[PDB]
């Protein structure tokens, strides 16, 4: 509840400041509106887009590597138990497996970034 | 009613569409109006100023063809699609209805061409999503004209 | 003669490549060299407060276009048209009607400080040194009108400071 | 389909001049770039035809503004060459001095602004302080800050003010220390290097066909110089040595600009040691105006003054092409003179106008983020390119 | 009486708004270098609060420096034309301020008035960085007397 | 829209000519010669035949297009250009 | 009289190429007038195009014709792309040219020997 009050405030001040920032410029002394805005023709900035697989793949590997990261995240709790052998075995095993994924993708044509 | 880029009339109708949807047409109809585009007016003034026999002669300007009913509102609202003031001073102002008296030198008596509403209306309106020219289906009220 | 760079043998021998893995890996050159040569910060910066202080200049500096006159002012300009004739921007105007005394001066002597490139040619060409580029740079008019000078404005510019210009000319006339 | 069409941007904070650009690309890679030049084109060459030699000279000052006394030297050498005159020795020496000083300017600018464009906000500041000292020299010399001519045909006029060469010496003393400070600021920086290493290389013969003349040919093989091979003035005598590079890598070109700054310090030094006290202008009264003391009190000096300003000296007809070494590379003017006062047709040669035409091939192999460095690396001013 | 509040607030939004005023540098030609020397350490801009940043949307005011050719002109007015409504134009250099050393031939536009309205004309070729700076300061002193709001109070 | 017919192609061509406003549909016959009868210009011809591509048509190059000059030539040219009966 | 003709030997192929060019324009008038968001109706724009062709209609020499065709495909080559802003494409139209009196006593009435 306490931190929820902090979230209620911190969401207010965001909202308030935003509102002030919208009022005052169109609450300003003189607001004048003329110029046309051409959405118009495709080559203004860039043109069109042939969205490329590289960036998307970066999102993907961000997923798989997340999953392995959070699967690894509880370890600081687990580093202390009555089975140490198994602990080391499967923690080194697990993040070693992460590094195996990375090593594979780094061996194939993936990444390499000039294309 | 003078019509143009930054003007206070048709732009106002474009901006009155907001909440409550009650600009006018309370009783409906009853409003005949003929907006005139601005450059025709100002050319009227400049010919009036540099042409003799424009002195001591009072006269008026006329929207050449349109002479629209309130169908204007839904037209200018139709084309350009869809995104401190005053009281019945203002809404009765815009609700004032007449073309008044025929005999007064209209336009050509001052020797200048007249502009129908359409094209210039597109120009000033702009807005919408801009990506399709389409048609826009001109109102063509011309009631009883 | 040719003395060329980057043609060298990088040593793949040991004790070079030691410091290469240290170099790539530990950023010592980057850190030490750069961060420190910026930590060179403490030297007193060079900045001058323009309202209250002004940078150096030279007796030959070129300001704005003051006309000059003799002691017991004669309107030193003879009207001889040279300053207009050599103007590389062509921006000058001279029209000279012989006045009451029979001596010749200019009716309208004009400049467009807009067009003016601030050569110095009109300062060299004047046989009597009537027009001289002022020391003062005093400007920033609010209208394109105000940058066009009558003979009158150029005179009043000359009256506003002369012993200034007299000091400069008296200094440098040995060079010209 | 794929590809794109992207466009320029109006300025980086230091931007000298504006180009547009159209690059047909692949995903974050540029297959075709087609720079649109001619954006800033003031039509000088048509103007020069309407103004006499003494008048048209500031055009040759400000067509390439950064390097200035060099362009001055180009046009002046052209009129002298075509006009059969030699300047007195001291004029030649002064002209050399400010020539290499100006070269120090355009190089320090090119390097620093090449940094500021890429990143690295500070070196621009450190060094352009010293550049301000340089203009502190010009202001004494010519009596104005930047565009002031101080160069004529038949030699320079208005020799140095008494006590100038002391200041010149003093700057030249520790400039070495400061440029070395830049060399620690860069050069083994993993960032700047690893950004520009192999980007935009060139084959020597290819550079010859594309006509690149400058730090291009220097840093890429093909050892060549106009300074060494075709000495155009006493600049022959003084000793110094030009750098080269074997990687053609655009990093070599950088380091070559640096070493040319250092060598410029050598040339400045030796020049300060060798200065003869002869005179300023030539002694021919009909080529160059007399000083005022002779002007007044003496008739023929007055006449040659008056006419030499109104009409200006007449140059015999002939077609010349002179070429000098300007900090952007080989610069030259092709003069065409009807026997007359005015010139007739003179087309300058902008090294940027050549080098710029090479982006098509040079940028073919690297994505746009380094097309930035590809443009900025070869010293270019879009005020000089257009003309 | 609220007019005291009026004038005071005027000196507030005005005081700040002028105290910063960080413009954009259009920088066509050799005036641009001199402008950079105004940005150099010696003459430094920052002392006066003017900040160096490039974008027409962030732009407080605009400095037209260099020669304005016919080909560039429309783009120039667009850069003017997406800008914070309060805005000011400072014409730098003999060229842009009415045509300078060209004023003739064809491609060059004569003055930047023919494109956008202008406030501070600073002559010089190039105007000495000190002179340009004096121009910016005088622009500030045009910002002082704006008295913009109390006429919105219509008295 | 079956395999096309004489009546079809004719109604189409005469139709698009009638939609074209610059020509006066007072007397327009299949035997008519444009610049002779209707007094058009070669430019007008080119624009027309362009409409003959954009509606129906689509195949026309220039060297064929220049010599049409009469609507029946449009008929037969498009006909044999596509399907025999 | 010798010559080095360019793309065509006789006025025939000239007329051919100009027919081609006018085809291109009549293709791309709508795409441009929609592309830069002009206020002109496609009909009007096309009419100005064919006008600009008709202005030069009196030429004979097919060298000249061919060169003019190079001009045309050049400018059209610039409008097919975005390299030319709304400005110039409008600049073909003259809105801001004041109407020039072409009748005598009006010209005499003002211009004093234009
Ligand atoms: C690269 C970052 C390293 C960070 C530190 C971690 C160090 C160890 C990193 C892994 C070694 C990388 C060596 C390079 C070659 C890797 C090729 C590869 O993994 O291909 C997938 C290999 C394919 O092997 P393969 O027999 O098909 O041959 C290689 C074929 N290529 C390279 C084309 C794919 O797949 C496997 O190894 C099968 C699944 C293994 C599951 C995990 C076992 C972990 C060990 C248990 C004991
Ligand atoms: C005895 C028991 C076992 C003990 C084992 C101990 C083993 C220790 C071995 C060394 C440990 C690691 C040392 C640090 C490694 C960090 C990562 C690294 O090496 O980065 C280097 C990398 C190289 O760049 P590059 O050559 O382009 O890439 C090669 C790719 N083929 O990237 C770079 O060089 C570029 C990175 C530049 C980053 C921007 C500049 C940063 C400047 C400030 C950095 C310093 C900040 C210090 C911290 C501040 C206070 C917290
Ligand atoms: S300094 Fe100015 S007035 Fe004098 S010659 Fe040059 S442009 Fe003309
Ligand atoms: S050169 Fe001197 S004296 Fe002659 S007209 Fe000009 S200012 Fe006057
Ligand atoms: S006024 Fe002078 S310094 Fe400025 S852009 Fe023009 S020529 Fe260059």
In three-state form (DSSP H/G/I as H, E/B as E, the rest C), the secondary structure along chain B is: CEECCCCCCHHHHHHCCCCCCCCCCCCCCCCCECCEEHHHHHHHHHHHHHCCCCCCCCCCCCCCCCCECCHHHHHHHHCCCCCCCCCHHHHHHHHCCCCCCCCCCCCHHHCCCCCCCHHHHHHHHCCCCCCCCCCCCCCCCCCCC
Q: What is the DSSP letter of C50?
A: T
CA atoms F66, F67, F72, F76: torsion sign: negative
Task: Report chain F's terminal Cα–Cα distance, integer Å.
Answer: 15
Nearest Cα residue to D54 out of B119, C104, C125, C74: C125
CA distance F58 to F51: 9
Q: Which helix (H) or strand (E) holds E152?
A: helix E148-152
Nearest Cα residue to D356 out of D39, D58, D70: D39
CA distance B61 to C9: 89
Breaks (C-N over 2.5 A) in chain E follow: none
CB contact under 8 A, E148 and A32: no
Q: Is the CB of E100 under 6 A from ligand 5?
A: yes
For the CA atoms of B43, B45, B48, B51, the dihedral, rounded to the nearest 10 degrees, stands at -50
B106 with B61: CB under 8 angstroms? yes
Residue with tokens 């003007």: B7
- Give me the total of CB pairs closer than 8 Å, taking one residue from chain A and one from chain G: 12
Q: Which residue does chain G place closest to B125, by CA atoms?
A: G39
Nearest Cα residue to D347 out of D56, D149, D35: D56
Residues with Cβ < 8 Å from G103, sequence gap 6 or more? none
Q: What is the largest CA-CA distance in chain G?
A: 50
CA atoms G3, G8, G11, G14: torsion sign: negative
How determined? cryo-EM
Q: What is the DSSP letter of F37?
A: I
User: Radius of gyration over alpha carbons of chain C, in Å?
Assistant: 29
E31 with E126: CB under 8 angstroms? yes
The two structure tokens encoding residue B17: 């569409």
Q: What is the DSSP letter of C173?
A: G
Nearest Cα residue to B99 out of B57, B62, B72, B142: B62
Count of C-beta atoms within a 10 Å radius of residue E61: 21
Q: Is the CB of D194 under 6 A from ligand 2?
A: yes
G34 contacts on B by Cβ (under 8 Å)? 133
Domain count for chain G, please give it: 1
Q: Which helix (H) or strand (E) holds D321?
A: strand D318-326
Count of C-beta atoms within a 10 Å radius of residue C127: 16
Residue with tokens 């008044």: B100
Let me know if chains B and E touch, i.e. at least 3 Cβ pairs under 8 angstroms: no
Q: What is the DSSP letter of E120?
A: E
Count of C-beta atoms within a 10 Å radius of residue E142: 15
Rounded alpha-carbon distances, angstroms, from residue G25 to A68, E54, G11, G72, G86 = 60, 40, 21, 9, 17
In order of start, what are the domains of chain D with their CATH numbers?
1-387 (1.10.645.10)
Rounded alpha-carbon distances, angstroms, from residue G92 to E142, G30, G55, G88 = 41, 16, 13, 7
For the CA atoms of D254, D259, D261, D262, the dihedral, rounded to the nearest 10 degrees, stands at 150
Considering CB atoms only, which of A43, A47, A114 is closest to D29? A114
Burial of C9 (0-12, 13-18, 19+ CB in 10 A): exposed
The CA-based angle A44-A45-A47, given to 5 degrees, is 80
- 3-state DSSP call for residue E87? coil
Relative to beta strand E89-92, strand E62-64 is parallel
Hey, is the C-beta of A2 within 8 angstroms of any chain E C-beta?
A: no
Q: Is the CB of C122 under 6 A from ligand 3?
A: yes
CA distance A97 to C95: 94
Domain count for chain A, please give it: 1
Q: Long-range contacts of range E9-16, CB-CB < 8 Å, 24 or more positions apart?
A: E9/E149, E10/E146, E10/E147, E10/E148, E10/E149, E10/E150, E13/E149, E14/E143, E14/E144, E14/E146, E14/E148
A14 with A8: CB under 8 angstroms? no
Residues with Cβ < 8 Å from D216, sequence gap 6 or more? D202, D207, D253, D329, D355, D378
Q: What is the resolution of this structure in A?
A: 3.9
Task: Report chain D's terminal Cα–Cα distance, integer Å.
Answer: 38
Question: DSSP string covering A81-94, please?
Answer: SS-HHHHHHHHHHH
Task: Report chain E's terminal Cα–Cα distance, integer Å.
Answer: 13
E34 with E126: CB under 8 angstroms? yes
The upper half-sphere exposure of residue B70, i.e. CA atoms within 13 Å in the direction of its Cβ, equals 13
Rounded alpha-carbon distances, angstroms, from residue G107 to B112, G9, G110 = 19, 45, 5
The phi, psi pair for D17, rounded to 5°, reads -150, 160
For residue B115, the CA-to-ligand 3 centroid distance in Å is 51
Question: DSSP string covering D123-167, please?
Answer: HHHHHHHHHHHHHHHHHHHHSSSSS-----TTS--SPPPTTHHHH
CA distance E96 to E101: 10
Alpha-helix runs per DSSP H in A27-112: 53-72, 75-78, 84-107
Please report how the helices G11-35 and G62-79 are oriented relative to each other, as an axis angle in degrees rounded to 10.
Answer: 20
CA distance D351 to B51: 60
In order of start, what are the domains of chain E with their CATH numbers?
1-155 (3.40.50.12280)
Q: Which residue does chain G place closest to B135, by CA atoms?
A: G41
Cis peptide before B104 (omega within 30 of 0): no
The CA-based angle E3-E6-E12, given to 5 degrees, is 150
Residues with Cβ < 8 Å from A38, sequence gap 6 or more? A44, B130, G36, G37, G86
Q: What is the largest CA-CA distance in chain D?
A: 81
The two structure tokens encoding residue D163: 């006590």
Q: What is the largest CA-CA distance in chain F?
A: 36
- 3-state DSSP call for residue C72? coil
Please report how the helices D89-118 and D69-83 are oriented relative to each other, as an axis angle in degrees rounded to 10.
Answer: 140
D36 contacts on G by Cβ (under 8 Å)? 83
CA distance A89 to A99: 15
Count of C-beta atoms within a 10 Å radius of residue B127: 14
Residues with Cβ < 8 Å from D384, sequence gap 6 or more? D63, D64, D65, D328, D350, D351, D352, D353
Residues with Cβ < 8 Å from A109, sequence gap 6 or more? none
Nearest Cα residue to A110 out of A51, A54, A67: A54
Count of C-beta atoms within a 10 Å radius of residue G74: 9
Residue with tokens 């003084």: D238
The two structure tokens encoding residue D141: 């010399």
For residue A73, the CA-to-ligand 1 centroid distance in Å is 23
Alpha-helix runs per DSSP H in chain D: 44-48, 53-62, 69-83, 89-118, 122-142, 164-185, 190-195, 204-209, 215-219, 226-229, 251-274, 292-295, 299-310, 351-357, 359-362, 368-377, 382-385
Residue with tokens 């906000």: D121
Residue with tokens 């000088």: D44
- Sequence length of chain C is 176
Q: Which of F11, F41, F76, F83 is catalytic?
A: F41
CB contact under 8 A, G16 and F62: yes
F77 with F68: CB under 8 angstroms? yes
Residue G84: which domain range? 1-114
CA distance A43 to C28: 46
Q: What is the DSSP letter of C45?
A: P
Hey, is the C-beta of C116 within 8 angstroms of any chain E C-beta?
A: yes
Residue with tokens 């500031």: D58
Q: Which helix (H) or strand (E) holds E131?
A: helix E129-144
CA distance D375 to D294: 52
Q: Which residue does chain F place closest to G26, by CA atoms?
A: F47
Which residue's CA is minimally distant from atom 12 of ligand 1? Answer: A103
CA distance D335 to D346: 5
- 3-state DSSP call for residue D120? coil
The CATH number of residue A113's host domain is 1.20.58.1610
Residues with Cβ < 8 Å from F31, sequence gap 6 or more? F70, F72
Written in H, E and C, the secondary structure of D219-249 is HCCCCCCHHHHCCCCHHHCCCCCECCECCCC
Nearest Cα residue to C87 out of C52, C55, C21, C131: C131
The upper half-sphere exposure of residue E152, i.e. CA atoms within 13 Å in the direction of its Cβ, equals 14
D256 with D218: CB under 8 angstroms? yes
The two structure tokens encoding residue D288: 């160059």
CA distance D52 to chain C (A): 9
Q: Ligand 5: which of E37, E95, E97, E99 to mutate, most ligand atoms within 8 Å of CB?
A: E95
CA distance D214 to D208: 11
Please report how the helices E3-20 and E129-144 are oriented relative to each other, as an axis angle in degrees rounded to 10.
Answer: 160
Count of C-beta atoms within a 10 Å radius of residue B20: 7
Note if F21 is an active site residue: no
Q: Which residues pair with E90 in a beta bridge?
A: E63, E120
CA distance C143 to E97: 10
Rounded alpha-carbon distances, angstroms, from residue D21 to E71, E81, E121 = 14, 22, 31
Q: Is the CB of C88 under 6 A from ligand 3?
A: yes
Considering CB atoms only, which of B5, B6, B130 is closest to A38? B130
Q: Is the CB of E91 under 6 A from ligand 5?
A: no
């Amino acid at each position: 509840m306490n931190l929820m009050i902090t979230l209620l405030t911190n969401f207010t001040l965001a909202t308030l400041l935003v509102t002030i920032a919208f009022w005052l410029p169109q609450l300003n002394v003189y607001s004048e509106k003329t110029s046309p805005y051409e959405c118009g023709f495709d080559p203004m900035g860039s043109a069109r887009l042939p969205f490329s697989m590289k960036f998307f793949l970066v999102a993907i590997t961000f997923l798989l590597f997340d999953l392995e990261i959070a699967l690894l995240l509880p370890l600081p709790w687990a580093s202390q138990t009555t089975n140490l052998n198994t602990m080391l075995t499967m923690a080194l095993l697990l993040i070693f497996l992460l590094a195996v994924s990375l090593a594979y993708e780094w061996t194939q044509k993936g990444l390499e970034w000039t294309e | 009613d003078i019509f143009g880029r930054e003007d206070r009339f048709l732009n106002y109708f474009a901006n009155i569409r907001w909440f409550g949807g009650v600009p006018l047409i309370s009783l409906g109809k009853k409003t005949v109006k003929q907006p005139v585009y601005i450059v025709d007016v100002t050319k009227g003034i400049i010919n009036a100023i540099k042409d003799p026999d424009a002195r001591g002669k009072t006269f008026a300007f006329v929207g050449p063809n349109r002479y629209l009913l309130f169908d204007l509102v839904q037209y200018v609202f139709a084309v350009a699609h869809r995104p401190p003031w005053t009281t019945r001073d203002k809404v009765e102002r815009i609700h004032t209805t007449d073309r008044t008296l025929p005999h007064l030198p209209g336009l050509e008596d001052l020797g200048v061409q007249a502009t129908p509403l359409e094209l210039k209306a597109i120009e000033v309106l702009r807005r919408h999503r801009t990506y399709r020219w389409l048609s826009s289906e001109i109102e063509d009220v011309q009631p009883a004209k | 003669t040719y003395k060329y760079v980057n043609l060298r043998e990088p040593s793949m021998d040991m004790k070079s490549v030691t410091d290469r893995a240290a170099q790539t890996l530990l950023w010592t050159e980057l850190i030490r060299g750069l961060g420190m040569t910026l930590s060179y910060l403490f030297r007193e910066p060079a900045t001058i407060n323009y309202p209250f202080e002004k940078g150096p200049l030279s007796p030959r500096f070129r300001g704005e276009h003051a006309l000059r006159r003799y002691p017991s002012g004669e309107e030193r300009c003879i009207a001889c048209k040279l300053c207009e004739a050599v103007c590389p921007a062509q921006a000058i105007t001279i029209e000279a009607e012989p006045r009451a005394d029979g001596s010749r001066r200019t009716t309208r002597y004009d400049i467009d400080m807009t067009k003016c490139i601030y050569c110095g040619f009109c300062q060299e060409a004047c046989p009597v040194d009537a027009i001289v580029e002022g020391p003062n740079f005093e400007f920033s008019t609010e209208t394109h009108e105000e940058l066009l000078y009558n003979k009158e404005k150029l005179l009043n510019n000359g009256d506003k400071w002369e012993a200034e210009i007299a000091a400069n000319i008296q200094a440098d006339y040995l060079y010209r | 389909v794929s590809n794109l069409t992207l466009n320029f941007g109006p300025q980086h904070p230091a931007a000298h001049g504006v180009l547009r650009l159209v690059m047909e690309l692949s995903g974050e890679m540029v297959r075709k770039c087609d720079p649109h030049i001619g954006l800033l084109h003031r039509g000088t060459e048509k103007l020069i035809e309407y103004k006499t030699y003494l008048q048209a000279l500031p055009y040759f000052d400000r067509l390439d503004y950064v390097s200035m006394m060099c362009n001055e030297q180009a046009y002046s050498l052209a009129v002298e060459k075509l006009l059969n005159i030699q300047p007195p020795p001291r004029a030649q020496w002064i002209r050399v001095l400010f020539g290499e000083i100006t070269r120090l300017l355009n190089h320090i600018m090119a390097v620093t602004t090449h940094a500021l464009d890429i990143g690295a906000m500070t070196p621009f500041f450190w060094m352009f302080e010293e550049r301000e000292k340089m203009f502190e020299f010009y202001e004494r010399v010519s009596g104005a800050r930047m565009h002031a001519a101080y160069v004529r045909p038949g030699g320079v006029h208005q020799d140095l003010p008494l006590g100038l060469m002391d200041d010149i010496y003093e700057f030249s003393k520790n400039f070495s220390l400061r440029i070395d400070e830049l060399e620690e600021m860069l050069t083994n920086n993993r960032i700047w290097r690893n950004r520009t290493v192999d980007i935009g290389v060139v084959t020597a013969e290819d550079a010859l066909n594309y006509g690149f003349s400058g730090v291009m040919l220097r840093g890429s093989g093909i050892q060549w110089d106009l300074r060494k091979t075709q000495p155009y003035d006493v600049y022959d005598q003084v000793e110094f040595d030009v750098p080269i590079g074997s990687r053609g890598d655009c990093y070599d070109r950088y380091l070559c600009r640096v070493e040319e700054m250092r060598q410029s310090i050598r040339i400045i030094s030796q020049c300060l040691n060798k200065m003869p006290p002869g005179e300023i202008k030539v002694d021919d009264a009909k080529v160059s105006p007399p000083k005022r003391a002779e002007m007044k009190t003496s008739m023929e000096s007055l006449i040659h003054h008056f006419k030499l300003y109104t009409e200006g000296y007449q140059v015999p007809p002939g077609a010349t092409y002179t070429a000098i070494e300007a900090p952007k590379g080989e610069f030259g003017v092709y003069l065409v003179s009807d026997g007359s006062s005015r010139p007739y047709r003179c087309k300058i040669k902008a090294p940027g106008f050549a080098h710029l035409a090479g982006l098509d091939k040079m940028s073919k192999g690297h994505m746009l983020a380094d097309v930035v460095a590809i443009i900025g690396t070869q010293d270019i001013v879009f005020g000089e390119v257009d003309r | 009486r609220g007019e005291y509040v009026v004038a005071k607030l005027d000196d507030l939004i005005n005081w700040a708004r002028r105290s910063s005023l960080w413009p954009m540098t259009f920088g066509l030609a050799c005036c641009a270098v001199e402008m950079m020397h105004m940005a150099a350490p010696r003459y430094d801009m920052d002392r006066f609060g003017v900040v160096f940043r490039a974008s027409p949307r962030q732009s407080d005011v605009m400095i037209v420096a260099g020669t304005l050719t016919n080909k560039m002109a429309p783009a120039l007015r667009k850069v003017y034309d997406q800008m914070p409504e309060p805005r000011y134009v400072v014409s730098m250099g003999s060229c842009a301020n009415g045509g300078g050393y060209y004023h003739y031939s064809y491609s060059v536009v004569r003055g930047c008035d023919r494109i956008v309205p202008v406030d501070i004309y600073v002559p010089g070729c190039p105007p000495t960085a000190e002179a340009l700076l004096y121009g910016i300061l005088q622009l500030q002193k045009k910002i002082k007397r704006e008295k913009r709001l109390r006429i919105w109070y219509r008295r | 829209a079956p395999p096309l017919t004489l009546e079809g192609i004719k109604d189409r061509v005469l139709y698009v000519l009638k939609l074209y406003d610059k020509i006066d549909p007072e007397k327009l016959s299949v035997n008519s010669h444009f610049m002779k009868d209707l007094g058009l210009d070669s430019l007008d011809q080119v624009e027309i035949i362009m409409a003959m591509e954009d509606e129906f048509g689509f195949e026309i190059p220039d060297i064929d297009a220049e010599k049409l000059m009469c609507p029946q030539e449009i008929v037969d040219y498009i006909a044999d250009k596509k399907d025999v009966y | 009289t010798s010559v080095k003709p360019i793309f065509s030997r006789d006025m025939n192929e000239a007329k051919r190429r100009v027919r081609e060019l006018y085809r291109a324009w009549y293709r791309e008038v709508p795409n441009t007038v929609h592309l830069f968001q002009l206020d002109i109706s496609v009909k009007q724009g096309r009419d100005k195009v064919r006008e600009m062709f008709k202005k030069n209609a009196h030429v004979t020499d097919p060298r000249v014709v061919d060169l003019l065709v190079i001009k045309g495909k050049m400018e059209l080559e610039e409008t097919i792309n975005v390299w030319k802003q709304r400005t110039h494409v409008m600049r073909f139209f003259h809105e801001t040219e004041a109407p020039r009196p072409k009748d005598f006593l009006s010209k005499f009435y003002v211009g004093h020997d234009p």
